[PDB]
Design an enzyme around this catalytic site. Structure first.
Site, short mmCIF file in Angstrom:
data_model
loop_
_atom_site.label_atom_id
_atom_site.label_comp_id
_atom_site.label_asym_id
_atom_site.label_seq_id
_atom_site.Cartn_x
_atom_site.Cartn_y
_atom_site.Cartn_z
N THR A 81 -3.28 -8.05 -6.48
CA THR A 81 -2.52 -6.74 -6.06
C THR A 81 -0.85 -6.75 -5.71
OG1 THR A 81 -2.72 -6.75 -3.51
CG2 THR A 81 -4.55 -5.81 -5.12
N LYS A 82 -0.69 -8.17 -5.89
CA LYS A 82 1.09 -8.64 -5.63
C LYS A 82 1.29 -9.76 -6.71
CE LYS A 82 2.65 -6.60 -1.58
NZ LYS A 82 3.51 -6.79 -0.10
N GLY A 121 -2.21 -0.83 1.48
CA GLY A 121 -1.66 -1.26 2.69
C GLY A 121 -0.27 -1.89 2.47
N1 LIG Z 1 -11.87 -5.48 7.29
C1 LIG Z 1 -11.52 -4.38 6.52
N2 LIG Z 1 -12.41 -3.71 5.64
C2 LIG Z 1 -11.96 -2.46 4.84
N3 LIG Z 1 -10.62 -2.31 4.87
C3 LIG Z 1 -9.68 -3.05 5.51
C4 LIG Z 1 -10.02 -4.09 6.56
N4 LIG Z 1 -8.78 -4.56 6.79
C5 LIG Z 1 -7.73 -3.95 6.35
N5 LIG Z 1 -8.32 -2.73 5.52
C6 LIG Z 1 -7.75 -1.78 4.88
O1 LIG Z 1 -7.23 -2.49 3.52
C7 LIG Z 1 -5.83 -1.93 3.20
C8 LIG Z 1 -5.39 -2.84 2.38
O2 LIG Z 1 -5.05 -4.35 3.19
P1 LIG Z 1 -3.87 -5.21 2.39
O3 LIG Z 1 -4.20 -6.62 2.82
O4 LIG Z 1 -2.46 -4.50 3.01
O5 LIG Z 1 -3.90 -5.29 0.83
P2 LIG Z 1 -2.69 -4.78 -0.37
O6 LIG Z 1 -2.24 -3.55 0.00
O7 LIG Z 1 -3.27 -5.05 -1.51
O8 LIG Z 1 -1.50 -5.97 -0.19
C9 LIG Z 1 -1.79 -7.26 -0.68
C10 LIG Z 1 -0.90 -8.27 0.26
O9 LIG Z 1 -1.40 -8.25 1.70
C11 LIG Z 1 -2.30 -9.27 1.61
O10 LIG Z 1 -3.33 -8.82 1.88
C12 LIG Z 1 -2.20 -10.19 0.57
O11 LIG Z 1 -1.85 -11.57 1.21
C13 LIG Z 1 -0.93 -9.75 -0.30
O12 LIG Z 1 0.21 -10.64 0.00
C14 LIG Z 1 -5.31 -1.82 4.50
O13 LIG Z 1 -4.09 -1.04 4.45
C15 LIG Z 1 -6.27 -1.24 5.28
O14 LIG Z 1 -6.34 0.04 5.20
#
Ligand SMILES: Nc1ncnc2c1ncn2[C@@H]1O[C@H](COP(=O)(O)OP(=O)(O)OC[C@H]2O[C@@H](O)[C@H](O)[C@@H]2O)[C@@H](O)[C@H]1O
Ligand SMILES: [Cl-]
EC number: 3.2.2.-
Length: 152
Positions: A81-82, A121
């Site tokens: 996603t990034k 997120g």
């Molecule tokens: N255990 C969990 N179960 C379900 N949903 C969750 C959980 N933890 C977090 N979330 C939800 O998942 C959403 C997405 O999480 P992000 O990690 O922010 O994913 P994304 O927006 O695609 O960002 C990608 C970036 O963040 C890191 O995860 C990754 O390393 C990358 O650099 C969050 O805003 C939150 O609402």
């Protein structure tokens, strides 16, 4: 026939064959869902670091880790996603990645799978648009249960 389900809770305890992780292409899982996946699934993490080191992680390709035939979940689907963690996500990244998700689900005969809100997120994408993409992409699937963890 198929079945797609919106649920609250914690993705990592979903009773499924395959889990979707949200990753970047630069080889760190430093926060959000990806941080939890690093803690929960260290072997998957090492394999991701290695795949990134090659050039093998890119937008529009799921990086799959097989945890073994007796593992539950069996598969981690690392979904890009990034690109760089410094930049937001983009809808396109989620569109391209969903297309590859569908292929590998079939190829691997994945019967059940769970996802988070892809890009919504740390990626900054509007959830309603992300959801629609997920619905159009995945309710289509025949003989696959899909668990989607809505945020709040
Ligand atoms: N255990 C969990 N179960 C379900 N949903 C969750 C959980 N933890 C977090 N979330 C939800 O998942 C959403 C997405 O999480 P992000 O990690 O922010 O994913 P994304 O927006 O695609 O960002 C990608 C970036 O963040 C890191 O995860 C990754 O390393 C990358 O650099 C969050 O805003 C939150 O609402
Ligand atoms: Cl990150």
């Amino acid at each position: 026939g198929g079945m797609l389900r919106f649920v609250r809770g914690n993705l990592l305890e979903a009773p499924v064959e395959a889990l979707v992780n949200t990753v970047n292409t630069v080889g760190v899982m430093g926060k959000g869902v990806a941080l939890q996946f690093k803690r929960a699934f260290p072997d998957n993490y090492q394999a991701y670091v290695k795949a990134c080191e090659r050039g093998q992680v890119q937008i529009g390709r799921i990086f799959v880790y097989d945890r073994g035939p007796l593992a539950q979940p069996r598969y981690i689907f690392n979904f890009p996603t990034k690109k760089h963690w410094r930049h937001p996500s983009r809808m396109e990244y989620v569109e391209e990645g969903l297309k590859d998700l569908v292929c590998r689900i079939q190829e691997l005969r994945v019967r059940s799978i769970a996802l988070p809100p892809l890009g919504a997120g740390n990626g900054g994408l509007p959830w309603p648009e992300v959801k629609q993409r997920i619905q159009e992409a995945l309710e289509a699937l025949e003989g696959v249960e899909v668990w989607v963890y809505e945020p709040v």
